[PDB]
């Protein structure tokens, strides 16, 4: 997260870390046994880390649980990043408490101009690198489709939306992928891609979750 703020411990209790001997992506807990992330975060032997704030220190709210299944969207395309969504099943159910809780799926797609909370442990600089210990937070608006498609001509599908600030300074970034965009208590977005981070006229692009709710519920139903 560039130009954001320290969220404060466990103020985002649906946020998880995907770990392979190091944090590489984020995710969102949607029930005790299932997590939502980006398809491009896919890899074998993932450890899901729930209840994290400082990913580099044991603070005593962590549940570390191994992924038992990874289900990439059947029509994910790694070149266009269309259908950049993936479901992860935990090997054992998380213990749901105050600092570890589900986020709700949306009933409807959100609209341009809504403010959302975007969070993760990604980079905080738009030039060079600085990686935080603690979870970062950003309030950002969903952009019109017109401005989205104008920022990235020919690269925005019906399953993506832009969110952020066209003047730069405030964005998601490397390390945030797979993490949540939450608008009025629903998961509307997944950190996916952009050109650079927090660059002028290059907003964050996010997977449009509302398009996927049936497929998510049926996938959970049948696995």
């Amino acid at each position: 997260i560039v130009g954001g703020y320290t969220c404060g411990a466990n103020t985002v209790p649906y946020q998880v870390s995907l770990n392979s001997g190091y944090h590489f992506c984020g995710g969102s807990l949607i029930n005790s046994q299932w997590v939502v992330s980006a398809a491009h975060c896919y890899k074998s032997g993932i450890q899901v880390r729930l209840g994290e704030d400082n990913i580099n220190v044991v603070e005593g709210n962590e549940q570390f649980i191994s992924a038992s299944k990874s289900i990439v969207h059947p029509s994910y395309n790694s070149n266009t990043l269309n259908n950049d969504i993936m479901l992860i099943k935990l090997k054992s159910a998380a213990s749901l408490n105050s600092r570890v809780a589900s986020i709700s799926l949306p009933t409807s797609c959100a609209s341009a101009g809504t403010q959302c909370l975007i969070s993760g442990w990604g980079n905080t600089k738009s030039s060079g690198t600085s990686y935080p210990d603690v979870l970062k937070c950003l309030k950002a608006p969903i952009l019109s489709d017109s401005s989205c498609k104008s920022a990235y001509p020919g690269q925005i599908t019906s399953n993506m939306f832009c969110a952020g600030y066209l003047e730069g300074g405030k964005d998601s970034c490397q390390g945030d992928s797979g993490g949540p965009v939450v608008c009025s208590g629903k998961l509307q977005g997944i950190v996916s891609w952009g050109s650079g981070c927090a660059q002028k006229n290059k907003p964050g692009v996010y997977t449009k979750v509302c398009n996927y709710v049936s497929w998510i519920k049926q996938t959970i139903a049948s696995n």
Partner: peptide
């Protein structure tokens, strides 16, 4: 199109 995995999409 640069994905936002750490440290990068291409670095893996």
């Amino acid at each position: 199109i640069s994905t936002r995995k750490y440290p990068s999409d291409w670095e893996e």
